[PDB]
């Protein structure tokens, strides 16, 4: 019932490979819209999803300012913390930054998001009051310094607090035959002896929309982890997901299992048995 | 859209 | 940090032998994210191959889909091979259809 807007930026040093790549990608839930490159060819900010095509050229220059402008920053923290952690001039280093908002079925403002990685590290986050900052180490002190006075927090809620929010709304609305759709998962199961004694019961859910989903076994009718296996959730590569989970049973005691698949797409969550 | 928040660290 | 990546060969739908079809490796839960993903057919790397869009999960790790269409057939057997700076060889799945 729920939406949610997410922007991710990633910039990666290649000393010696050459000059810094960025790359950023919007997503709107688990529906990529807008996507940027640094050694793309058109260095356009270009979309991804039909139902945000219907934006005035404006909208694809404001953009792509502000990713060329945010590249070039990037560029500017690279060598930045590589002065503060006192990093060699060869090291390979990244910086990912995500941020966004949520809103109910109701489109009320639910919650702001801005965190910041160096190396896969947390390196400094925004509470939830979109007000204080939180910094993990002693170096991320200092910037949490030159951002406490330069009242960027303030710029920050102003933003995600108002203008994601309304973007978002107007997306949602826009694509909604599309990004309020509830495809429900296409279920099977598949069946294969693994000893004399044994075989495998694989719980398949395809063809679902959103990715959030959940799959699990039961014995007898309790759940059962023992002897099973759970795949991450995997893209289909139509804008479609798709899950499984198997177990390891005794042969001829498959009537005994029973996998439960629960999806918002589905009104009541299903049983399938063998 | 995107935002104009441009500050380096 | 070096978090290993995670593999997936798959279809896009059940494997039926004849009909078009794509081909998905899904690599994810790795960083960082300097990595290189081939499709082989038979063991030879296959030239038109497309990936989604660099993009990382909450925990901050990276994750990509390579993407080629395909017509699956009874003797062709496809595999993903990975590059990564966490494998001093690459890392070279083969495609299970049941799976």
């Known amino acids: ?274 | 859209t995107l935002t104009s928040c441009n500050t380096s660290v | 940090i070096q978090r290993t990546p995670k593999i997936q060969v798959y279809s896009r739908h059940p494997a039926e032998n004849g009909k078009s079809n794509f081909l998905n490796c899904y690599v994810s839960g790795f960083h960082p994210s300097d990595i290189e993903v081939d499709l082989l057919k038979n063991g030879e790397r296959i030239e038109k191959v497309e990936h989604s869009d660099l993009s990382f999960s909450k925990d901050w790790s990276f994750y990509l889909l390579y993407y080629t269409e395909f017509t699956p057939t009874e003797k062709d057997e496809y595999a993903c091979r990975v590059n990564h700076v966490t494998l001093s060889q690459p890392k070279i799945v083969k495609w299970d259809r049941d799976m």
Request: charged share 25%; proline share 4%.
């Open chain 1, 1 to 274: 019932g729920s939406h949610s807007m997410r922007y991710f930026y990633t910039s990666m040093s290649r000393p010696g490979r050459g000059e810094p790549r960025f790359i950023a990608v919007g997503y709107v839930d688990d529906t990529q819209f807008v996507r940027f490159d640094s050694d793309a060819a058109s260095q356009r900010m270009e979309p991804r999803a039909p139902w945000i095509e219907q934006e005035g050229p404006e909208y694809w220059d404001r953009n792509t300012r502000n990713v060329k402008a945010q590249s070039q920053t990037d560029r500017v923290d690279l060598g930045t913390l590589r002065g503060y952690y006192n990093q060699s001039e060869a090291g390979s280093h990244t910086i990912q930054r995500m941020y966004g908002c949520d809103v109910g079925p109701d489109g009320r403002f639910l919650r702001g998001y801005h965190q910041y990685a160096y190396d896969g590290k947390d390196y400094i986050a925004l509470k939830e009051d979109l007000r204080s900052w939180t910094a993990a180490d002693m170096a991320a002190q200092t910037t949490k310094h030159k951002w406490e006075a330069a009242h960027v927090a303030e710029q920050w809620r102003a933003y995600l607090e108002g203008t994601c929010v309304e973007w978002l709304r107007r997306y949602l609305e826009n694509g909604k035959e599309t990004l309020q759709r509830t495809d429900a998962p296409k279920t099977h199961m598949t069946h294969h002896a693994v000893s004399d004694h044994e075989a495998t019961l694989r719980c398949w859910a395809l063809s679902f929309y959103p990715a959030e989903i959940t799959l699990t076994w039961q014995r007898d009718g309790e759940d059962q982890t023992q002897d099973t296996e759970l795949v991450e959730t995997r893209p289909a590569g139509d804008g479609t997901f798709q899950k499984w989970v198997a177990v390891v049973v005794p042969s001829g005691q498959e009537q005994r299992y029973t996998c439960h698949v629960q999806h918002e797409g589905l009104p009541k969550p299903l049983t399938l048995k063998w």
